[PDB]
Amino acid sequence: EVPLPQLRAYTVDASWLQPMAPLQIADHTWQIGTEDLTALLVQTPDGAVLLDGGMPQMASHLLDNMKARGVTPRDLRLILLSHAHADHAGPVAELKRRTGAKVAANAESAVLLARGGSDDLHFGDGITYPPANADRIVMDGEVITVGGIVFTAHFMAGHTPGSTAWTWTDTRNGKPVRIAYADSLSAPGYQLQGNPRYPHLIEDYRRSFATVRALPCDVLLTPHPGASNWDYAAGARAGAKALTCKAYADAAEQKFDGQLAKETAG
């Protein structure tokens, strides 16, 4: 007599859940997540912005890192997201409860976030998290300005429909640094061709490769740092080997073309 299976928790490599101290990227930009998941704090005279939070259990760690940086819960003004999967948007609901932060996201990301990542086009209910509501819906190319830092949304659908690259200009050693936080361009276990839930998946990915290639991009960061060749545990050399946006897009496209061939064969 065989019962139905137990629910399976979304488990991940230890490095994804390994806390790290804040790592400075530019004068007002810091990595405050874990060794293998990005969560970017951008510190402004008019309050702080967080781009991604990582996994659901990273909430208190993020708040601790913010505190270390001189950012109290009420100082957090905005949360922005690369995409609404559990390993990047996971703590967003809790962050909203515990801080003054409002979430801006595109329509697709907002809808997936509000579902807590359930009914995912590819994952189903395999990888879910506490749902959260967006406070503001953003359009492609729309800018949001916080204490003088201008964040621009660049839609790059594929990994999720609502996948977004966020760009802004910070400063370092006296000069401006155009940072590109480009979303994932992977398709882990995705049915790419003739997917009834995403009929134009392939065409969106191709447009997203071109979008990522063309971003203003002195420094590239990615939700999974390894994808842009970042090593957050490497301290002063964390970003030394980082890819350009062009190289990141090219690598993603070559990998995607291989996955297409393997799927056709499969």
Ligand X SMILES: C[C@@H](NC(=O)CCS)C(=O)O
Least distance from C-beta 28 to its own copies, angstroms?
Answer: 9
> Is the Cβ–Cβ distance between 106 and 98 less than 8 Å?
no
The yes-or-no answer on residue 129 being catalytic is: no
The binder of 15, among its own copies, ligand X, Zn ion, none, by C-beta within 5 to 8 A per type, is none
What distances in angstroms separate CA 208 from CA 18, 104, 179, one per listed residue?
30, 21, 18
Binding to ligand X by residue 52, rule CB under 6 A? no
For 120, list phi and psi in degrees, rounded to 5.
Answer: -70, 145
Determine the Cα angle at 185 with ends 142 and 221, to 5°.
70
Least CB distance to Zn ion at residue 223 (A) = 6
* Residue 224, annotated as binding a ligand: yes
Of residues 98, 102, 206, 224, which one binds ligand X by CB under 6 A? 224
The one of Zn ion, its own copies, ligand X, none whose footprint includes residue 45, by CB under 5 to 8 A per kind, is its own copies
- Give 26's contacts (C-beta < 8 A, 6+ positions apart): 170, 171, 172, 177, 179, 219
Would you say 256 and 185 are in contact if contact means Cβ atoms under 8 Å apart? yes
Q: Which does 105 bind (CB under 5 to 8 A by kind): its own copies, ligand X, Zn ion, none?
A: none
CB of 170 to its own copies, least distance (A): 7
Q: What are phi and psi of 239, to 5 degrees?
A: -95, 5
Residue 170 within binding range of its own copies, rule CB under 8 A: yes
Residue 263's binding partner among its own copies, ligand X, Zn ion, none (Cβ under 5 to 8 angstroms by kind) is none
In single-letter form, the type of residue at position 36 comes to D
Residue 85 makes contact with ligand X by CB under 6 A: yes
CA angle 105, 177, 161 (to 5 degrees): 25
Site for ligand X, rule CB under 6 A: 85, 87, 184, 186, 188, 224
Site for its own copies, rule CB under 8 A: 27, 43-45, 69-71, 145, 147-149, 169-171, 173-176
Residues annotated within the binding site for Zn(2+) are 83, 85, 87-88, 159, 224
